[PDB]
Amino acid sequence: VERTYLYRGRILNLALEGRYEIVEHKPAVAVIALREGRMLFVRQMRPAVGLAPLEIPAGLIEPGEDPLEAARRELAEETGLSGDLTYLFSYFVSPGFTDEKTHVFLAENLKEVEAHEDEAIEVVWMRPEEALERHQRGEVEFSATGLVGVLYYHAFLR
Amino acid sequence: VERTYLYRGRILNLALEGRYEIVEHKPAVAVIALREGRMLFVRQMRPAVGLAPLEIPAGLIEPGEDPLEAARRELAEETGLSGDLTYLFSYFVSPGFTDEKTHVFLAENLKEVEAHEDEAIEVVWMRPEEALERHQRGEVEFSATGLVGVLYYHAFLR
Numbered sequence: 001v002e003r004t005y006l007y008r009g010r011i012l013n014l015a016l017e018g019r020y021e022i023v024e025h026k027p028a029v030a031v032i033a034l035r036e037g038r039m040l041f042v043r044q045m046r047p048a049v050g051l052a053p054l055e056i057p058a059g060l061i062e063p064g065e066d067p068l069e070a071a072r073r074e075l076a077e078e079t080g081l082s083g084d085l086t087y088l089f090s091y092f093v094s095p096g097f098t099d100e101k102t103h104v105f106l107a108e109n110l111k112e113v114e115a116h117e118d119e120a121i122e123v124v125w126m127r128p129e130e131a132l133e134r135h136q137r138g139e140v141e142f143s144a145t146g147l148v149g150v151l152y153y154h155a156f157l158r
Numbered sequence: 159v160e161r162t163y164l165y166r167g168r169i170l171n172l173a174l175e176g177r178y179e180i181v182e183h184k185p186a187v188a189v190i191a192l193r194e195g196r197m198l199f200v201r202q203m204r205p206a207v208g209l210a211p212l213e214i215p216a217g218l219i220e221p222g223e224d225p226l227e228a229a230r231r232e233l234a235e236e237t238g239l240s241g242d243l244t245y246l247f248s249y250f251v252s253p254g255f256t257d258e259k260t261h262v263f264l265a266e267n268l269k270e271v272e273a274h275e276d277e278a279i280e281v282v283w284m285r286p287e288e289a290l291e292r293h294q295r296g297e298v299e300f301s302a303t304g305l306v307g308v309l310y311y312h313a314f315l316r
């Protein structure tokens with residue numbers, strides 16, 4: 001059960017636990033938002049993958065914040081919107097090697113609170129049906145958060 | 159764009175790319191299977207999180223394999239079953255730090271090909287509605303693969 005640390009970083013630590021390679025990572029949040037049949041996706045260059053996958057607004061929980069507060073913050077910083085947020089569920093992104101846990105919220109009754117992360121983040125309103133069709137046609141890649149948003153919409157928001 | 163390697167491991171590498179911390183990881187597969195209203199979940203101890211989340215059968219793509227072949231293999235190794243497999247979609251588990259990509263399949267017409275990973279892996283057939291209710295009640299944690307299976311079922315398999 002003990003860990004020995006190979007790297008202590010900015011957004012992760014690398015440890016060994018016995019024979020296991022473990023990446024400790026801050027928890028994250030993600031926000032599903034629908035308006036007039038379009039879901040609020042975002043894209044940004046992601047150096048780990050060398051491309052900009054289709055995501056939903058997401059970010060890390062910072063010191064002092066709970067998940068709800070982090071979700072409100074990254075919705076505003078990434079898209080300039082506020083909404084009424086409801087906790088949906090959480091998931092471990094890849095529990096075979098990392099402890100990153102993502103907390104997912106629904107946002108309703110959106111309002112623009114900032115006109116304008118604008119240089120870094122592209123806001124992509126798109127019907128989820130179209131996002132899934134583009135992905136099936138090889139036109140865009142998903143992050144887990146983007147795919148979860150699309151599936152949740154099809155399951156519960158039509 | 160260049161990477162310098164801090165750690166070259168068994169199931170990951172850690173690199174720095176500029177100011178970015180990047181974990182390279184093999185691609186993965188996951189299999190959604192439904193029978194008589196129950197989804198095929200699995201649980202195993204996951205040292206990264208210190209608990210056994212609810213997952214679907216999943217594993218790493220090994221040298222020589224494509225995603226379909228890996229999916230067939232881990233369905234058989236984890237559960238002793240074979241099926242007719244259909245590619246659904248893929249996702250990057252957490253593209254802000256890792257390049258791990260998961261390829262998700264549906265399995266139908268399941269057949270037991272091995273009686274019996276049996277010590278390590280618990281097979282948990284469970285209605286997806288119940289999995290989501292247990293999670294909402296705080297009784298179980300999800301992996302991304304488990305949550306994707308539950309959402310896909312509710313969206314398309316009822």
Ligand SMILES: Nc1ncnc2c1ncn2[C@@H]1O[C@H](COP(=O)(O)OP(=O)(O)OC[C@H]2O[C@H](O)[C@H](O)[C@@H]2O)[C@@H](O)[C@H]1O
Pocket residue numbers: 019020021022093094095096097098168169186187216217218219232258301303
């Ligand atoms: N952290 C680790 N460090 C070193 N070796 C490991 C570790 N975890 C597993 N192994 C060994 O590495 C091999 C792991 O193999 P397989 O069983 O195909 O995959 P999976 O179910 O682990 O992971 C599938 C996905 O599910 C999760 O979301 C994961 O993060 C993945 O995204 C075996 O030899 C293990 O002993």
Ligand SMILES: Nc1ncnc2c1ncn2[C@@H]1O[C@H](COP(=O)(O)OP(=O)(O)OC[C@H]2O[C@H](O)[C@H](O)[C@@H]2O)[C@@H](O)[C@H]1O
Pocket residue numbers: 010011028029058059060061074100143145177178179180251252253254255256
């Ligand atoms: N790999 C990295 N290395 C170092 N710093 C980083 C890296 N990536 C981001 N930063 C810095 O770290 C902070 C990252 O912050 P925020 O914007 O809240 O989050 P997110 O959208 O990146 O990640 C949200 C989730 O979406 C994805 O699935 C991710 O993997 C997460 O699971 C900022 O200061 C970045 O400059």
